[PDB]
C-alpha cells in the first residue's frame, strides 16, 4: 500500500482542504536572521534595480548620491525589477484618481488628519512594535527610547514641557542643529554630525511573524526622530484609503468580503453579453526595494498643494529623512585558520581593512559599496525597507488601477481590481482572447513606469470565478480564510485576569472573520485554557498536584462551597462558552462566588477588564 494526502483534491474542492497545506499559526522556529551577508545583497539589488548611473556629491557628508528617479537608462531586459520613477505619469494618475473621487477629496482627508493630530499627545509614540535607540545603539520598545530621549534633552538643554506631538517634532528639529548633546551612559556627549547620523541610523531586525510568507528577514527598525512624521503620513494615507473601494489594508474580513462581492457584482452588471472578463492573482516582488521616498514627497506636495502650508512642510519631513538613511551593517565577518583551532572576530567598519582575506563572493559584493560607507554603515539614499508607508503604497497602487484612456475605449476593453500593500487581484475585460493580452501588457507597462513590478513565478491568472487575496481563497462560493491568529502567554505575560479575556475576545474576532467555526473555537478555547494554566503554573482542585501555589490552595479550599465560582487562577473551573465570551468569567461568577471569597478578592485596600486582586505590576 501507498499514501498520497492529495487525492482528496480530486472529488472535492480546494477551498475546503487548502488549510491542510500550511502548518498551524505560531512563532516561526526558523529563526530568520539579519546577517551582514543578507544586509549587503539587499543593498546591491537595490542599487541595481536602479537602471541609472548618475550621482551628485552632497555638501553635508561629501558623499555621492545615486539619484534614481526620472533618469531611466539601461532599458534592456526591462521585465526585471525597476526603481526609476517618472513624476509626470505619477501626477497624472493622481489627477485621474482625484477627478474620479472628487476635487476637495485630498483636502478633506488632510484636514481630518490634521485636526486628529492637533489633539494628539506625543505619548502616543510609545505605541509601537520596536525602534532603535540612538544612544545605546540597540533596539527596544518605543517607551524606553522615548524616556531616554526626553531625559537626555533634560540633561543637556532642560526639559521638554510641550506635552504634544508638534512641540516634540519642533524639539527634534532644533536638536538637529545642536552642536553638543548629552546623555547618561554606563555620562557622555556627542557632536552634531554623529548625532545626525545616529538619528538617521537604521537597524535590521530578525523578527518576522505572520501567516503566508515571512519575507521580512531584515525588517527595518528606525529610531524615534522620524517616528511622529511617519505616523502623520500614515494617518493621512489611511484617511485616504478609507474612501477607496479597492483598499483592503485598513481592515479585513467581513468588510473585505463585502468589497470583493461589491466589486464582482458591479463588474457583472457593468459589461455586456459580448464581453468576457478574467482574473489575475498578482504578487508584487521587491515592494520594498523599488519604493522611493522622492516620488512620495512629490505626491504629498501635489496633494497638499491647496491647504495649510503647515501640512505642506510637515508631510515633507519623513520623505527627506528616508532619502538620506544610513543603514547599520549587521555583525561583521569572522576569520579562521585551516584546522579552525583559532578564529578572529571583526566588525563591519574594518572589513574594508582585510578585503584581501575575504572570499571572492563577499569581495565582489563589498568593493563597489565602499564608497557609500562612512564608518560601519551604508548611506542608502532611497528605497523603502521598513514595513512603513503601506497605506501610501496602496494609494499609489489604486492610482495605477484607476487609469483609463481612449486607446482602450476604442477597443472595448478595460480593467479594475483590488490591491493590498504588495499583493493584488486584477479583473480584466475585453471581447477577444487576444485583446486581453494587450490589456495585460498595457497594465504591466503602466505599473513598471513607476517601479511597481510584478512576479512571473508567483503571479497567475484564470477565468473570473477563481482567485486568491490575502489568504482569502475566493471561489464561486465557500469563501475560505486562513488568517487564524492565536495568543502567546510566555512571550506576552501581563496578568492572570487579562490574558484570558483577551484570548476570548481574539477567538470571538476570528469567528467573526469566519476563520474559525464553533467546534474549532471550542477546541481552541480548551487549549488556551491549558496553556494559561501551565504558564502561570496553576491547576484545578480536583487534580492531585503538588505545586507551590497549590499547597495553600490544597488547605484553604474546604472552607468554600461555590467551587463553580472559583477563579481559574485559584483552582477554578470554566463556565464561559461561545455565547459568553464578551463576558469575563469574573462578571459571570460574581453573584456565585461565596461572600467571603468574593470580598477577599474585591478589596481595594490591598497591596496592589474587571480590576481584580490578580495583577503582577
Amino acid at each position: 500500500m501507498e499514501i498520497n494526502p492529495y487525492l482528496m483534491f480530486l472529488n472535492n474542492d480546494v477551498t475546503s482542504l487548502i488549510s491542510t497545506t500550511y502548518p498551524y499559526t505560531g512563532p516561526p522556529p526558523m529563526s530568520h536572521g539579519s546577517s551582514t551577508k543578507y544586509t549587503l545583497e539587499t543593498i546591491k539589488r537595490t542599487y541595481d534595480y536602479s537602471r541609472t548611473s548618475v550621482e551628485k556629491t552632497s555638501k553635508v557628508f561629501n558623499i555621492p548620491r545615486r539619484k534614481f528617479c526620472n533618469c531611466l537608462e539601461d532599458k534592456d531586459e526591462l521585465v526585471k525589477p525597476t526603481g526609476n520613477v517618472d513624476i509626470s505619469s505619477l501626477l497624472g494618475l493622481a489627477e485621474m484618481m482625484e477627478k474620479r473621487m472628487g476635487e476637495g477629496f485630498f483636502k478633506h482627508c488632510v484636514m481630518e488628519a490634521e485636526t486628529e493630530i492637533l489633539k494628539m499627545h506625543f505619548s502616543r509614540l510609545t505605541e509601537g512594535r520596536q525602534t532603535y535607540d540612538w544612544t545605546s545603539e540597540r533596539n527596544m520598545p518605543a517607551a524606553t527610547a522615548l524616556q531616554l530621549t526626553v531625559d537626555a534633552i533634560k540633561e543637556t538643554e532642560g526639559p521638554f514641557k510641550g506635552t504634544t506631538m508638534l512641540e516634540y517634532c519642533n524639539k527634534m528639529i532644533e536638536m538637529l542643529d545642536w552642536k553638543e548633546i548629552k546623555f547618561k551612559k554606563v555620562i557622555d556627549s556627542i557632536k552634531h554630525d554623529e548625532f545626525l547620523i545616529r538619528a538617521l541610523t537604521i537597524n535590521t531586525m530578525a523578527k518576522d511573524g505572520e501567516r503566508g510568507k515571512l519575507q521580512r528577514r531584515a525588517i527595518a527598525t528606525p529610531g524615534m526622530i522620524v517616528r511622529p512624521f511617519s505616523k502623520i503620513v500614515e494617518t493621512v494615507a489611511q484617511k485616504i484609503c478609507e474612501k477607496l473601494k479597492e483598499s483592503g489594508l485598513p481592515v479585513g474580513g467581513n468588510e473585505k468580503k463585502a468589497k470583493l462581492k461589491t466589486t464582482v457584482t458591479s463588474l457583472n452588471a457593468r459589461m455586456n453579453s459580448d464581453q468576457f472578463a478574467v482574473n489575475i492573482t498578482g504578487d508584487n516582488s521587491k515592494w520594498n526595494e523599488c519604493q522611493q521616498p522622492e516620488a512620495y514627497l512629490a505626491l504629498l506636495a501635489y496633494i497638499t498643494k491647496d491647504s495649510s502650508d503647515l501640512m505642506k512642510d510637515l508631510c515633507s519631513v519623513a520623505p527627506v529623512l528616508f532619502c538620506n538613511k544610513f543603514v547599520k551593517l549587521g555583525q561583521g565577518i569572522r576569520l579562521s585558520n585551516k584546522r579552525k583551532t583559532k578564529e578572529v572576530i571583526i566588525k563591519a567598519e574594518k572589513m574594508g581593512k582585510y578585503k584581501n582575506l575575504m572570499r571572492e563572493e563577499y569581495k565582489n559584493l563589498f568593493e563597489p559599496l565602499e564608497k557609500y560607507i562612512q564608518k560601519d554603515v551604508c548611506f542608502l539614499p532611497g528605497g523603502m525597507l521598513m514595513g512603513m508607508f503601506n497605506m501610501l503604497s496602496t494609494v499609489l497602487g489604486v492610482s495605477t488601477l484607476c487609469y483609463m484612456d481612449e486607446e482602450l475605449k476604442a477597443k472595448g476593453c478595460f480593467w479594475t481590481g483590488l490591491q493590498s500593500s504588495d499583493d493584488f487581484v486584477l479583473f480584466a475585460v475585453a471581447s477577444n482572447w487576444s485583446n486581453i493580452h494587450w490589456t495585460i501588457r498595457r497594465f504591466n507597462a503602466v505599473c513598471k513606469l513607476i517601479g511597481i513590478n510584478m512576479s512571473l513565478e508567483k503571479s497567475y491568472g484564470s477565468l473570473p470565478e477563481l482567485f486568491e487575496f490575502t489568504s482569502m481563497f475566493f471561489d464561486g462560493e465557500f469563501v475560505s480564510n486562513l488568517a487564524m491568529e492565536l495568543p502567546a502567554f510566555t512571550t506576552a505575560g501581563v496578568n492572570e485576569g487579562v490574558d484570558f479575556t483577551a484570548a476570548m475576545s481574539i477567538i470571538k474576532t476570528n469567528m467573526i472573520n469566519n476563520s474559525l467555526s464553533p467546534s474549532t473555537a471550542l477546541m481552541a478555547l480548551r487549549i488556551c485554557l491549558q496553556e494559561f494554566r501551565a504558564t502561570y503554573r496553576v491547576h484545578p482542585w480536583d487534580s492531585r498536584v503538588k505545586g507551590g501555589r497549590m499547597k495553600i490552595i490544597n488547605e484553604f479550599i474546604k472552607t468554600i462551597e461555590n467551587k463553580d465560582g472559583l477563579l481559574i487562577a485559584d483552582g477554578g473551573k470554566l463556565m464561559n462558552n461561545i455565547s459568553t465570551l464578551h463576558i469575563p468569567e469574573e462578571v459571570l461568577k460574581f453573584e456565585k462566588m461565596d461572600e467571603q471569597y468574593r470580598n477577599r478578592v474585591f478589596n481595594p485596600k490591598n497591596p496592589f477588564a474587571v480590576v481584580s486582586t490578580h495583577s503582577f505590576r
Binding site: 502561570y536 495553600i552 464578551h582
Partner: protein, 599 residues
C-alpha cells in the same frame, strides 16, 4: 523568585506571614501571596460599587441572561445583536435565537410536514393495507398544535402549503389540490401542451433491459428548486430548450439535472452506468422502482455523477453576444464554452398560479393520479427515514413508534428493581435483614434484564456481582445503590476468567462499581435519588446509613481502610497474590486512589 511588586504597610496591616507553610510570599512578593490574600485576609463590602462602575459589562451579562435560545439550521445566503452576531449567525449555519417576539406558525408548519412525512412512511410496511393503515394512523394521531390540542384529520386540509407529503396524505381524504406537482424535492408545473404515455427500454451492463415510460408530445413546464427558477420544454424523451433566472451554481446544477431526468434526455436512458450494474436493483425491500428515481439516487451519492450526467448533455463553445446568457459546467454565470440549449439570466422567473382544485386517486403504492396519468406525488420522492423527537403529540395506534432501545430497556429494568423494594416482605430489605441473598439471584426482574447483558463473558460478571452481594449481605454492611447497580448480572452461573473493572451490556455500554456514570449515578446528600441518563428516579424507601457503608461495594474480597501512601500501587490482576494485613493503594476511578486491605 519575587518578581511581583507589592506595598509594605498594606502587607503588615494584613498580617501576612512569610513561609506560612514553606511559601515565602515576599517591595517584592511572589504570586502565591495573592492566593494567601484571597483565601485568608481582610473582608470588605464593595459589591455595589464594583457593579455600578462596571455597569456596562454587567448589563451585557444581564442582556445575555435575558435570551430565549432557539433552534439552529444549516443554510446559506439564498447593535445588541452585533455584540453577539459572532455566535448568532455565520455563513453555513445560523441560530434563530429571539429576544421578545413570538409567533409559532412556521415552526408549526415544519412540525406538521415532518409528522406527515413520518406517518406516510410508516404506512409503507405492507402491500395491501396501505390506505387503511395510513388513515387509521391519522385518526390515532392528535397534537397540541401551537396552543390548541387539535387532531391531525383537519390540519392537513385547513392548511395551505404544497408539499409531497401533504398532498399524498390529503388525497386519501378527498381533499382539494392546487394542480402542483412534485418530482423529488423539485417542484414542477405545466404551462402548455399535452401528450400521452409511451414505453421504451434501457440496458444495464449491455445485456439486460428494463422498461420505462415517458411522453412523446411537446409540453412546456416551470421547474423550480431552492433559490432557482426555470422554464423548459420537453419533446419526445428529450429536452428541447430551457432557461433559468436564479443564479446559483449548485442550485442551478441540481435543478437542471432534475429537469433533464424529468425529460429523460441523455444516453444513460439508453444504457446505464457501470455503477448501476453493481446493483441493478431498481427495487425496494419488496417493491419495484422506476429508472428515474434510481438515477436520482445515483446522483445524490456524489456530484461526480451530476457532472457525468451534464457531460452526457452536449457541451459546445459559446459564440459572441451569448456569454451574458451562457452557462458553465459548474454553474458559472458566463463562460467561453457552455452547454447545448441553455440560457442563463438574472431575476427569478415569476411563477404562475392555478386556481382550479381537484381530487386524485391513490394506488397500491399510494401514487396519486389526477388524469391522463400525470403522477403528482408519491413516497419515492421522499427522503430516507429520519428519526426526530416529536412533542405536543399523541400517537396511539400500533406502529406509532417502536419505543424500544437498549437504553430504555435498562432504564425500565432498574425502575423495576427499585420498585420491587416496596417496603415490605418478600422484597429487598426483608431479604437483607434475613440474609437470604440466594433468592436475589432468582428474581424475575433480573431475568428480564439478563438479555441486555454481554453474553460472551457474563459468567464472570455474575460471579463478581454475587461475590459483592454476599459479602455485603452476610456482614450486614452494604449500600442499596451499588447492589441494585450490580444485581442484573446475578442471574447466570459463575465461571473463572479475567475481570477488568467494568460490566458491559450488549449495547457496548458498561457499568462500574464504586463510581458514577451516565447510565447510573448517585451521590450522598441526595441519596433518595438515582440518576439514569439524567433522569432522576425516587426510592420507595428512606435511608441514612444503609448506603453510608460502601467499604465492600468497591472490590470483592477487600475492604477500604485508612489512607497510607507507603502502600504500593497495584492493579486488579495481581490482587490474587496478596496476603492479609497487607495494605495496597489502587485507583478507584479517574485520578481517584484509595487504600484497601483484604477481607
Amino acid at each position: 523568585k519575587f518578581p511581583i511588586i507589592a506595598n509594605k504597610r498594606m502587607l503588615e496591616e494584613a498580617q501576612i506571614p512569610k513561609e506560612h507553610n514553606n511559601v515565602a510570599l515576599w517591595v517584592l512578593a511572589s504570586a502565591s501571596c495573592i492566593n494567601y490574600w484571597n483565601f485568608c485576609g481582610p473582608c470588605v463590602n464593595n459589591s455595589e460599587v464594583i457593579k455600578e462602575v462596571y455597569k456596562s459589562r454587567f448589563g451585557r451579562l444581564e442582556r445575555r441572561k435575558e435570551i430565549m435560545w432557539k433552534e439552529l439550521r444549516f443554510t446559506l445566503v439564498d447593535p445588541e445583536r452585533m455584540e453577539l452576531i459572532h455566535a448568532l449567525g455565520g455563513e453555513t449555519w445560523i441560530q434563530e435565537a429571539n429576544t421578545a417576539g413570538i409567533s409559532n406558525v412556521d415552526q408549526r408548519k415544519n412540525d406538521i410536514r415532518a409528522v406527515c412525512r413520518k406517518v406516510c412512511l410508516a404506512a409503507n410496511a405492507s402491500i395491501m393495507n396501505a390506505k387503511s393503515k395510513l388513515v387509521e394512523y391519522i385518526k390515532s394521531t392528535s397534537m397540541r398544535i401551537g396552543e390548541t390540542e387539535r387532531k391531525l384529520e383537519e390540519l392537513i386540509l385547513e392548511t395551505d402549503d404544497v408539499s409531497p407529503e401533504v398532498t399524498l396524505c390529503k388525497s386519501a381524504l378527498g381533499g382539494q389540490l392546487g394542480k402542483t406537482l412534485s418530482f423529488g424535492p423539485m417542484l414542477l408545473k405545466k404551462i402548455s401542451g399535452s401528450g400521452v404515455k409511451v414505453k421504451d427500454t434501457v440496458y444495464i451492463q449491455g445485456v439486460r433491459a428494463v422498461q420505462f415510460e415517458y411522453w412523446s408530445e411537446q409540453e412546456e413546464f416551470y421547474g423550480e428548486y431552492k433559490s432557482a427558477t426555470a422554464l423548459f420544454s420537453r419533446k419526445e424523451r428529450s429536452l428541447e430548450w430551457i432557461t433559468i433566472g436564479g443564479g446559483i451554481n449548485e442550485d442551478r446544477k441540481r435543478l437542471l439535472a432534475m429537469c433533464m431526468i424529468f425529460c429523460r434526455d441523455g444516453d444513460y436512458f439508453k444504457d446505464a452506468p457501470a455503477t448501476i450494474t453493481m446493483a441493478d436493483l431498481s427495487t425496494k425491500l419488496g417493491r419495484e422502482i422506476p429508472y428515474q428515481y434510481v438515477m436520482m439516487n445515483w446522483i445524490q451519492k456524489s456530484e461526480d455523477n451530476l457532472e457525468a450526467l451534464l457531460y452526457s448533455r452536449g457541451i459546445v463553445e459559446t459564440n459572441p453576444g451569448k456569454m451574458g446568457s451562457s452557462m458553465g459546467i459548474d454553474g458559472s454565470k458566463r463562460a467561453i464554452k457552455s452547454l447545448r440549449a441553455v440560457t442563463i439570466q438574472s431575476g427569478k422567473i415569476d411563477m404562475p398560479e392555478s386556481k382550479e382544485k381537484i381530487h386524485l386517486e391513490l394506488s397500491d403504492n399510494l401514487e396519486a393520479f389526477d388524469s391522463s396519468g400525470r403522477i403528482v406525488a408519491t413516497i419515492l420522492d421522499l427522503p430516507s427515514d429520519k428519526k426526530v423527537t416529536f412533542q405536543d403529540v399523541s400517537f396511539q395506534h400500533p406502529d406509532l413508534a417502536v419505543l424500544r432501545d437498549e437504553k430504555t430497556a435498562i432504564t425500565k429494568g432498574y425502575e423495576a428493581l427499585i420498585k420491587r423494594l416496596g417496603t415490605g416482605d418478600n422484597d429487598i430489605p426483608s431479604l437483607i435483614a434475613k440474609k437470604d441473598y440466594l433468592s436475589l439471584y432468582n428474581l424475575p426482574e433480573v431475568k428480564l434484564m439478563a438479555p441486555l447483558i454481554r453474553p460472551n463473558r457474563k459468567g464472570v460478571y455474575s460471579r463478581v456481582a454475587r461475590k459483592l452481594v454476599s459479602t455485603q449481605v452476610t456482614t450486614g454492611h452494604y449500600s442499596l445503590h451499588e447492589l441494585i447497580k450490580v444485581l442484573p448480572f446475578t442471574y447466570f452461573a459463575p465461571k473463572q476468567g479475567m475481570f477488568e473493572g467494568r460490566l458491559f451490556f450488549s449495547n457496548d455500554s458498561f457499568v462500574e462499581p464504586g463510581v458514577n456514570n451516565n447510565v447510573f449515578s448517585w451521590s450522598k446528600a441526595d441519596s433518595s435519588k438515582i440518576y439514569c441518563h439524567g433522569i432522576a428516579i425516587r426510592v420507595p424507601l428512606v435511608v441514612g446509613d444503609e448506603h453510608m457503608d460502601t467499604s465492600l461495594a468497591l472490590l470483592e474480597g477487600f475492604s477500604v481502610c485508612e489512607n497510607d501512601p507507603r502502600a504500593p500501587m497495584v492493579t486488579r490482576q495481581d490482587l490474587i497474590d496478596v496476603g492479609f494485613g497487607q495494605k495496597v493503594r489502587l485507583f478507584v476511578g479517574q485520578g481517584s486512589v484509595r487504600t484497601f486491605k483484604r477481607t
